């Protein structure tokens, strides 16, 4: 099945690895070399997640938890019973996340597009890599990563946040939250703006680009561009993930005490 305009776009070329062997479509999906690599890592990682569930006490979806090894194993590959299975799944996830990004770059190259989508996705991958690779390496043990469980990884976030007695006082966390909140507000504004022009008051014609700019100047005194809003949305969403990666990588590797005590520098200014 193809869209009514899809046939003329399904051409060869644009791949980073391979030729006509991996230049086909399986149903709607495009399969490249990195499509094949994605399926390998997804299948291996998911099957090992199912095995970790079978080793545990329950099949309940919310209660399944595959935990990282103890801190005493210290950057080694622990026994698979004792957390080594978590490390293997982590490698499969890294390979699948990397393959997904490279597969996206191949698709945009075939369509004559920019490379923005792979790099925007790389912000999320960087945050994940900080959580399970960079910060655990700086702290010296793979056991500093979070467990793989729907509600188990919420317990990790709670306990890690309270390792600094008040995680709200983290300066980088405060900035990252502002990025997340502003992004949600801007997305609601952008979604409303396009829909209100395209679906206007009943019986009236569809509005124009002037209508958007006039409306937001009337409301706020300033109207970002049609390209400005898409630049801002990319900046807010990706910057939220980048500031999240900073906020967690400075807790422990750089700051070990409580986060409220960090604000001594502001209170001890000479003035």
């Amino acid at each position: 099945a193809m869209l009514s305009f899809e046939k003329k776009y399904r051409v060869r070329g644009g791949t980073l690895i391979g030729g006509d062997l991996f230049d086909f479509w399986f149903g709607p999906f495009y399969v490249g070399f990195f499509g094949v690599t994605t399926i390998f890592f997804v299948t291996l990682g998911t099957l090992l997640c199912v095995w970790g569930a079978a080793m545990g006490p329950t099949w309940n979806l919310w209660q399944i938890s595959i935990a990282p090894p103890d801190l005493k194993y210290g950057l080694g590959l622990a026994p698979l019973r004792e957390g080594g299975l978590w490390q293997i799944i982590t490698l499969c996830a890294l390979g699948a996340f990397g393959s997904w990004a490279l597969r996206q770059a191949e698709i945009s190259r075939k369509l004559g597009m920019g490379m923005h989508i792979p790099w925007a996705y790389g912000g999320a991958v960087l945050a994940y890599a900080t959580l399970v690779v960079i910060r655990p390496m700086l702290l010296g043990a793979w056991g500093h990563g979070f467990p793989y469980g729907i509600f188990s990884h919420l317990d990790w976030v709670s306990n890690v946040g309270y390792q600094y007695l008040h995680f709200h006082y983290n300066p980088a966390h405060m900035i990252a939250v502002t990025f997340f909140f502003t992004n949600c507000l801007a997305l609601a504004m952008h979604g409303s703006l396009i829909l209100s022009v395209t679906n206007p008051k009943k019986g009236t014609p569809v509005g124009t680009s002037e209508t958007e700019n006039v409306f937001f100047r009337d409301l706020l005194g300033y109207s970002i561009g049609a390209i400005g809003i898409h630049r801002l949305g990319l900046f807010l969403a990706v910057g939220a993930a980048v500031w999240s990666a900073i906020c967690i990588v400075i807790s422990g590797p750089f700051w070990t005490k409580g986060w409220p005590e960090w604000w001594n520098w502001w209170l001890n200014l000479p003035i």
């Binding site: 099945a1 193809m2 869209l3 009514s4 305009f5 899809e6 046939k7 395209t198 019986g203 009236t204 014609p205 569809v206």
Partner: protein, 60 residues
């Protein structure tokens, strides 16, 4: 009753609302490029493609 409580009822009402909303948005997603072309003939997923939507333009 005893096991059933207000939070669970509200959660399931939200689940029904979310599934309805997803069906509506998926219907809206099929307003361009449909019906699909296949060797076996025309194809539409669930939800089916909606009626043709026409816009209104200002007079010249």
């Amino acid at each position: 009753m005893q096991y059933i409580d207000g939070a669970q009822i509200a959660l399931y009402a939200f689940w029904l609302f979310f599934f309805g909303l997803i069906i509506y948005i998926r219907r809206e997603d099929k307003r361009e490029g449909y019906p699909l072309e296949s060797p076996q003939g025309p194809r539409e997923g669930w939800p089916a493609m909606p009626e043709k939507k026409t816009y209104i333009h200002r007079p010249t």
